[PDB]
Amino acid sequence: ETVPVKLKPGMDGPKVKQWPLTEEKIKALVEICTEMEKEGKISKIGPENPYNTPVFAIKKTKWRKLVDFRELNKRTQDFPHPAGLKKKKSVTVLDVGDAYFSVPLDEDFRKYTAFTIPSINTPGIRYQYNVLPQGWKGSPAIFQSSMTKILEPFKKQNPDIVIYQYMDDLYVGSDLEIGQHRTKIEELRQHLLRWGLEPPFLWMGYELHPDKWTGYDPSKDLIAEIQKQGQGQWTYQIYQEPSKNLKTGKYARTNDVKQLTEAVQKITTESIVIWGKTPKFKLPIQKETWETWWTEYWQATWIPEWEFV
């Protein structure tokens, strides 16, 4: 059985142009998509489908596909965050996005997930999803019940570990001694493999220590500003009303966009840990300079919204 999904009343699906990619990124995307197609997760389509969402490829040997569903997400219907996560000595971020590929996507909604692998030449290759896609806000919401069953035996044996999922990421928090924390993360990886997950980047662990980090309305949106200082030094604030800050910080570095891009990722990760939401950024940089370079330094599996200022 599949979950029926609608766009928000009054909205059509996304029609976002694919941006130019290097020959190397295209090659990688073609191999990834060929295998997804073989595996039935996507299907080729033609120009009868008017929708489109951008795709590119990142490196964290192996490229990873990254579909920029920011517009589709804004257009999709609406469907818990642990307060203790930010309190844990260590939080390790795992990538598990391959998990969504086992659940079919409402046949009526598939057309809206269309994307285009550009070509060096010709228009390029168009596909749409048949299965819950990575990066789409409905996929965790539909899969939520199944991931609870998968995690439940592990949570039962480890009641003091906090596990929180945001999109493709699992955030796993413990107060254990660092060696023991890391060994428990491997135990969780192996638990997931025994339940069928085979995510190619699961082996990596991105390690946070939020207890060492520096009035919130869930309905409200989080906003982040960033200011360039100097010699690789940036400052930021997260708020909801410009005066009433919820967090402030500094990131320290090479070029600016690369540093700004790392700062944006770091700030978003903190927001996800603290509140479970990505903020909307006000970026101190020119649109065209940002757009030329940010994908060269992006390593996250999500993408926040941004504006330029």
Residue numbers in the entry: 6 to 65, 69 to 87, 95 to 136, 139 to 214, 224 to 240, 318 to 356, 362 to 417
The authors write:
The globular fingers, palm, and connection subdomains of FPC1 overlay well with those of both the p51 subunit of RT and the p51 monomer. Similar structural agreements were obtained using the FPC2 structure. Although crystal structures were obtained for both FPC1 and FPC2, the FPC constructs did not crystallize readily, perhaps due to the dynamic behavior of several loops.
Formation of active HIV-1 reverse transcriptase (RT) proceeds via a structural maturation process that involves subdomain rearrangements and formation of an asymmetric p66/p66′ homodimer. The viral RNA codes for a p66 protein that forms an asymmetric homodimer in which the RNase H domain in one subunit becomes destabilized, leading to subsequent unfolding and proteolysis in order to form the active p66/p51 heterodimer. We utilized the isolated polymerase domain, p51, rather than p66, since the initial subdomain rearrangements are largely limited to this domain. Two different fingers/palm/connection (FPC) subdomain constructs containing the same interfaces that are present in the monomers and in the p51 subunit of the RT heterodimer were investigated using both NMR spectroscopy and X-ray crystallography.
